[PDB]
């Protein structure tokens, strides 16, 4: 009765949005960047190798000073590194060894971790005693935590495999806002430079844009053909990039509300684990599970270089805030810094 | 180097020493993954052998066992099943008293789960210990309700031994490439204390095979 009427009404609006975004596609990005000089060839080399983890690395995150970094492994340890000297600052043991994510606070006073225990744990680094101790255990989710990112010293955002993201207040311990619009597990997060809106990607092959204050969904993007495992903003804040299990990466735009470019090759048949951008926005770095990393010209859809030197799957990568180095982690229990 | 740089280097060396000792301690333990259905009977196994996932620890004849139970995670398991890639054994619990019951028949659901786990890409050479629980209720119920309800093409005698053998064969036949892994089967009940010995005997073979590989001759 009314159910089928509502189904027909819902089907009548997807056609409208599709026709609306088909009428604002006069040109293409490849058609506009056909008269600029290509970046020739990127020859990068390993400058440091960080050793010490005894199992496979799952996550890493750079600090805002571009010298310190944090790493997490299935061995049950969280390690803080000084990359200029290659020596350890802190080693933190975890109650649960099934960790899947970690983050670093912009101020530099706290770190965070989580995994299959369905809890996000926050660690204080600066105490009158010389040790590191737990400050809060945030516990409200029903699935495993896949990503987390600080906003300041008192706000954090989490995404879980129970089809939900959340915004927390660390002092009280409660979640002020819950974001629920997806259909499968949410695998990745990304914060905008102004910390006023964020994007998420899930296992329903969709990406969504959110408003932190009001708490609602603004835009939905659908191009891929399998699960989405990585997401990242353009330095401007007006575009973003996604990686999936269908051996492609894609570039999406916010103001035009559609897709701009696909990155793929016929010799690549495996999935993508991570994505990141360069400081200018001209290079796009992607990590694959055929043991190496690829560098793409983001304006021309061309391959400009390969990063090889890992013996197993590449799990995570990151670029510094000053743009001086790139770091890669892997399932072989090693971290590498390239420049 | 300045004085403070030397002090920092000493701090790093001590951290490295502690990490090495912890790794050496952790590398000498037996890790088990526990799987089954909701009503299969795992709580009885846990009692006899002693949100998120649950961990159990016990000790038997100078060996340390950590058992991991993941029954509360109701989500896509293709995303976290590779965390358990390096693990000594998988315990699989099946109740052979629910062939008559319906949630789709329960026994067929158990077969689908067993088939999915056994032929995965992360568990090519991992041993499986299979427990078949609640044989008393099965022996009582095999006389009234026939087994043809579950298996239409049975065509055999209706007693305890024939039915038990048929069900075991049906479960063991789902192992494609039965030349790179072993499957152990045991018939248990509610009041029975011999299962820890069964697990110990199964794990000794894995230990022998692993420390032949450390010495070179695989």
């Amino acid at each position, epitope marked *: 009765s009314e159910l089928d009427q509502l189904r027909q009404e819902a089907e009548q609006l997807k056609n409208q949005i599709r026709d609306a975004r088909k009428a604002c596609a006069d040109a293409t990005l490849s058609q506009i960047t056909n008269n600029i000089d290509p970046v020739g060839r990127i020859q990068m080399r390993t400058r440091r190798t960080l050793r010490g983890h005894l199992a496979k690395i799952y996550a890493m995150h750079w600090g805002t000073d571009s*010298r*310190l970094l944090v790493s997490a492994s299935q061995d049950g340890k969280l390690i803080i590194w*000084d990359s200029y*000297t290659t020596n350890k*600052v802190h080693a933190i043991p975890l109650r649960s060894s099934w960790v899947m994510t970690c983050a670093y606070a912009p101020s530099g006073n706290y770190v965070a971790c989580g995994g299959l225990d369905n809890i996000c744990s926050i660690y204080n680094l600066k105490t*009158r*005693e*010389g*040790n590191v101790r737990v400050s809060r255990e945030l516990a409200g989710h029903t699935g495993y935590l896949s990503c987390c990112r600080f906003l300041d010293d008192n706000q954090i955002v989490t995404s879980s495999g129970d089809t939900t993201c959340a915004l927390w207040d660390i002092e009280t311990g409660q979640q002020t806002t819950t974001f629920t619009g997806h259909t499968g597990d949410v695998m990745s997060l990304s914060l905008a430079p102004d910390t006023r809106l964020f994007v998420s990607g899930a296992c329903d092959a969709s990406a969504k844009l959110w408003d932190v204050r009001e708490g609602m969904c603004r835009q939905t993007f659908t191009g891929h053909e399998s699960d989405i495992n990585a997401i990242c903003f353009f330095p401007n804040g007006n575009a973003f990039a996604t990686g999936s299990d269908d051996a492609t990466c894609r570039l999406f735009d916010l103001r035009a509300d559609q897709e701009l470019m696909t990155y793929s090759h016929d010799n690549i048949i495996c999935g993508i684990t991570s994505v990141s951008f360069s400081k200018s926005g001209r290079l796009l770095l992607a990590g694959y599970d055929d043991f190496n990393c690829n560098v793409w010209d983001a304006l021309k859809a061309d391959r400009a270089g390969v990063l090889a030197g890992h013996d197993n799957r590449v799990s995570c990568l990151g670029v510094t805030d000053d743009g001086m180095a790139v770091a890669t982690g892997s399932w072989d229990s090693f971290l590498k810094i390239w420049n | 180097l*300045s*004085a*403070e*740089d*030397k*002090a*920092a280097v*000493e*701090r790093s060396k*001590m951290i490295d020493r502690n990490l090495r000792e912890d790794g050496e301690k952790a590398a000498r333990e037996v890790k088990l993954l526990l799987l089954g259905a909701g009503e299969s009977g795992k709580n009885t196994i846990v009692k006899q052998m002693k949100t998120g996932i649950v961990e159990t620890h016990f000790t038997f004849k100078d060996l340390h066992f950590k058992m991991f139970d993941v029954g509360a995670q109701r989500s896509e398991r293709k995303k976290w099943i590779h965390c358990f890639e390096g693990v000594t054994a998988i315990i699989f619990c099946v109740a052979l008293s629910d062939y008559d019951l319906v949630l789709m028949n329960r026994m067929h659901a158990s077969m689908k789960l067993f088939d999915s786990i056994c032929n995965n890409k992360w568990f090519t050479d991992t041993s499986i210990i299979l427990f078949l629980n609640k044989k008393d209720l099965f022996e009582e119920k095999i006389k009234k309700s026939p087994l043809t309800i579950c298996y239409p093409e049975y065509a055999g005698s209706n007693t305890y031994e024939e039915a038990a053998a048929y069900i075991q064969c049906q479960f063991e036949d789902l192992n494609k490439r039965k030349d790179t892994k072993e499957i152990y089967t045991h018939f248990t009940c509610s009041t029975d204390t011999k299962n820890v010995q069964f697990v110990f005997d199964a794990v000794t073979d894995v230990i022998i095979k692993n420390n032949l590989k450390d010495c070179g001759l695989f």
Partner: single-chain antibody
Amino acid sequence: VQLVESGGGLVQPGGSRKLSCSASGFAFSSFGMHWVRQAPEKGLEWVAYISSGSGTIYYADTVKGRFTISRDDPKNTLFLQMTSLRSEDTAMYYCVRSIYYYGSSPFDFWGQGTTLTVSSSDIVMTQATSSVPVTPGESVSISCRSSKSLLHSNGNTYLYWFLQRPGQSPQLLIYRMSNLASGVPDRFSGSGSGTAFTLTISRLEAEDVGVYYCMQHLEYPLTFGAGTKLEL
């Protein structure tokens, strides 16, 4: 967080004595320890250093061969043993904690001290002033000079400022040149270059009166400088 030391008293020349210090409220095993003494009316002077894990030990040249330093982590105690006591060892002794990693703040908590009475190639740090008359509400500057550049090739400058109030143990103000310590008001600032350094107080209340000391940490044996007094 507290450190209480004991021993002390009056001994005849030629004797030997042991001094102890007990810590409570922090992680003692991850810290290094220093012994620092002060003469009855003179300035500060560094004595001995022991490291975390008991791997590195350092002595001054006035006590090498006569003194010994040791620690007991399980009972949280630090020991200093003295043999062949002259009359120049009459002083007050303080225990100091310090930790070393990237970004740490060494020398940030001192004990209370014990008194010992006996009956009867080094950097020089200079403070040419003494006893500046000051009035509340004004602004004050103090100067210091080294005989060797304290700027290492890694971009660090190792200069420390300390404050001692009447009847109290010294307190850290600025650890590495231009770095402010925890719990210290933003009135204080520090600057300098190469071999010449200065400290500045913007508008001063009546509690920041005492003696101000400077120290270098470029290399051992960790020299001090005779302080400057602020009088009201």
